[PDB]
Design a protein around this ligand. Structure first.
Ligand code: HEM
Ligand code: HEM
Ligand SMILES: Cc1cc(N)nc(CCc2cccc(CCc3cc(C)nc(N)c3)n2)c1
Ligand SMILES: Cc1cc(N)nc(CCc2cccc(CCc3cc(C)nc(N)c3)n2)c1
Ligand SMILES: C[C@H](O)[C@H](O)[C@H]1CNc2nc(N)[nH]c(=O)c2N1
Ligand SMILES: C[C@H](O)[C@H](O)[C@H]1CNc2nc(N)[nH]c(=O)c2N1
Ligand SMILES: [Zn+2]
Lengths: 401, 404
């Protein structure tokens, strides 16, 4: 009923009553455990009501008439339209809760701090881009990054979704040239050709910042060049290895995830983008030396000076380390918020902790909390965790086309 | 699609379907309403079925499924369990029974070498003492002057209305950890509760750090006896680093052979209570679990101090600068001493190749992702970008209640 959750570093034995809330199921079954897998009217009121109780409880005003005369209002609204709309305050609480509820997210200690720009008063892709510059301008805060989420209108069935066509407001470009080899970012290959398709002058630099494809409910998407000025790019240097930056490397400073769906009390917003700040490894481990991506490992080391004739030689580790460090130093230098996998993990164990007090636990995808490198070297690694689907929650959806 | 688990490799974009999981006659903790994947600690008529489950595998493995040979092996255990209550396995039935447990077991990265396994049959051992002899014999084959082979040494099974053979020492090689007055420990924080028993069962401790414990060898309804390994058998690797000379001086040593020995091996509804198996290490085990864990040898601080590292803040990556070196230096030692060992990269490759191989024979492979992926440099390795399907198959090495 309530899974015993020993931590193995301290001997800390905790118990989860939060799961019993999760009213919506996942990939695992009694006989097999798909833990590691990457992807998956009558009922609307059901989720409305509950969420609205979720809400009022927060501000402790649960029960009181305001409560029930909103439960009055939403009950009727759907009973006469098919759908309902959330007040500002309501979606603020909800968008927050989605973050709080996302089990792949190590950066959760921070969920309280979140700006919730309300873009539901938008109807043109030409307003969209604007609503997004006001987002990027507020989050970048020219160094001191701040966590925020601009939310475009809800989906309603008689028509298309508003969508952002690229999977992170900022991404570098990808250019497969006869060779079957890519200049720039190989993830962002499929996307870049679409911008070429829907009219775009392409670049060729290792890191060319892209445009923006925004589509409004039924309508050919529209291209919008991000004012270069508004894109905080971080040069990349090594604190002790002078040879480095000659490599000509960098990364953007703002991680805005645009391709996800937001679910609140049943209502779903297809486009609702959001952006905190980077966790070192993300850039220097995955986004770089990872083959399926920038894949730098080899050079880094050939430079460094390490026997790639053999793996046991351990060049791949010694290389990451320095790239993963060469990132923090640059970032800390160029004075741009950034949190390292160690700094990160401690604080989550405090989240993990603080949450246990409030709610009776916190769902967490273990296989994802644990950093991409040096696992055993973080506290999270030695901590059993439970992951289950809650709500309001962030979900994936089909690539717009 | 195919009404079966669907397993993608997010590096080659390949897919594969698990058909084998519908073999698992054992459920785990996970329900579709939450996932306890992370979690560490997890008759007669209802024994007889467990048995038939086995034989059928044995036969449909020599490929004689259907024969009289088969249909009368089943018409004999039915006879044995009927009149006995238990049932003894035939010779090569067991040898099979072991390799399957290994093959079946979800947390073991080292399964490409799965059919190498030597089965030493010791189902005749009836003296607490004789046990020692076997074990000793094992180590010498297993050690092989350093060319470590794999192997296992089944001692007899349980009877309803008998005692149990048991090997107390969780592992056959355990470094003594003496509770200090400091409130601290000199030795190996893990092997304390056991060091503490050796003393109560009559062991005079030395007081080093890498003292080798003695074995506490139980035999049914007999208080365990105490045996010391002749040091010539217990091969030991001093630790140095290829560049950092000072490393050597840390005094750090470590032992070649892992032998797990407090695990119940279950074949066909049988229980082998003392059933100890060995192989060779994977560097990170020693250099990350053993020598770096905050609650073991935890050398990470001392080592970072020497490489002259800003251990004041985490954004110097001192920890990551250290482990890496410490993990390397551990490999560079078995290079040198000509002792067997496999590094995470090398190892995590064979796994895919095992996975690839196994997709053909069984059409599936049980894998406990968290345990398959190495405690340094996850993404750095192939296994990392691979979805996996954990589940309970038999033969099976089970966890077992410690005797006292
Ligand atoms: C403040 C800085 C933050 C850090 C350091 C952080 C950390 C992370 C990391 C490392 C991941 C895994 C990303 C990956 O490897 O794919 C993640 C996942 C996630 N994060 Fe954050 N996070 C932060 C803020 C946020 C914010 C502001 C939101 C938006 C409300 C958010 C929502 C999510 C969601 C929904 C996932 C699930 C990943 C998925 O299933 O695709 N995070 N978080
Ligand atoms: C050939 C050399 C081998 C290597 C390199 C290897 C590697 C590993 C490693 C690294 C682990 C996880 C260790 C941990 O983090 O605690 C493991 C688990 C395991 N291994 Fe092996 N292994 C080898 C041989 C064997 C053999 C010979 C057996 C016995 C037949 C075996 C049975 C198991 C079992 C049952 C587990 C998981 C048990 C559990 O904790 O639930 N392995 N293996
Ligand atoms: C806020 C935030 C903070 C932070 N430190 N890092 C990120 C970027 C990493 C990330 C976080 C959350 C979700 C995704 C999208 C992953 C994804 C999933 C699918 C199904 N398809 C894709 N193309 C991409 N990426 C975002
Ligand atoms: C052959 C072998 C090869 C190799 N590379 N590593 C090991 C050691 C890792 C291991 C493999 C299998 C089982 C266990 C035991 C886990 C355990 C359980 C309990 C109950 N207490 C413990 N202290 C440890 N440990 C053994
Ligand atoms: C196949 C595997 O499940 C997948 O690559 C996961 C594993 N763990 C991860 N952990 C983090 N932090 N980020 C990730 O993208 C992933 N990817
Ligand atoms: C709590 C945590 O899940 C557990 O202790 C696991 C994590 N991953 C591991 N992975 C390996 N290889 N070995 C381990 O002991 C562990 N410990
Ligand atoms: Zn699971």
């Amino acid at each position: 009923k309530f899974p015993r959750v020993k931590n193995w570093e301290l001997g800390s034995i905790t118990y989860d009553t939060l799961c019993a809330q999760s009213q919506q199921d996942g990939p695992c079954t009694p006989r097999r455990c798909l833990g590691s897998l990457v992807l998956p009217a009558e009922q609307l009121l059901s989720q409305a009501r509950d969420f609205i109780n979720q809400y009022y409880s927060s501000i402790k005003r649960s029960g009181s008439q305001a409560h029930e005369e909103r439960l009055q209002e939403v009950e009727a609204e759907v009973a006469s339209t098919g759908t309902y709309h959330l007040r500002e305050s309501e979606l603020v609480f909800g968008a927050k809760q989605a973050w709080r509820n996302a089990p792949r997210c190590v950066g959760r200690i921070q969920w309280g701090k979140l700006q919730v720009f309300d873009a539901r008063d938008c109807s043109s892709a030409q307003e969209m881009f604007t609503y997004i510059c006001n987002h990027i301008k507020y989050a970048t805060n020219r160094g001191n990054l701040r966590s925020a989420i601009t939310v475009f209108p809800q989906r309603a069935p008689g028509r298309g979704d508003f969508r952002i066509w690229n999977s992170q407001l900022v991404r570098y470009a990808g250019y497969r040239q006869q060779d079957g080899s890519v200049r720039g970012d190989p993830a962002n290959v499929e996307i870049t050709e679409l911008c070429i398709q829907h009219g775009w002058t392409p670049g060729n630099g290792r890191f060319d910042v892209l445009p923006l494809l925004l589509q409004a409910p039924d309508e050919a998407p529209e291209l919008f060049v991000l004012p270069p000025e508004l894109v905080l790019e971080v040069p990349l240097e090594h604190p002790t290895l002078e040879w480095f930056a000659a490599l000509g490397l960098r990364w953007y400073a703002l991680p805005a995830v645009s391709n996800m769906l937001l679910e609140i009390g049943g209502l779903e917003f297809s486009a609702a983008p959001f952006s905190g700040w980077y966790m070192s490894t993300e850039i220097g481990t995955r986004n770089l030396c990872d083959p399926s991506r920038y894949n730098i490992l080899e050079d880094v080391a050939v430079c460094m000076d390490l026997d790639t004739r053999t793996t046991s030689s351990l060049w791949k580790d010694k290389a990451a380390v320095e790239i993963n460090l060469a990132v923090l130093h640059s970032f800390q230098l160029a004075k741009v918020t950034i949190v390292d996998h160690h700094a990160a993990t401690v604080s989550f164990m405090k989240h993990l902790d603080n949450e246990q007090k409030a709610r009776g636990g916190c769902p967490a995808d273990w296989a994802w909390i644990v950093p991409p490198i040096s696992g055993s070297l973080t506290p999270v690694f030695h901590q059993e965790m439970v992951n289950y689907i809650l709500s309001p929650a962030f979900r994936y959806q089909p690539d717009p086309w």
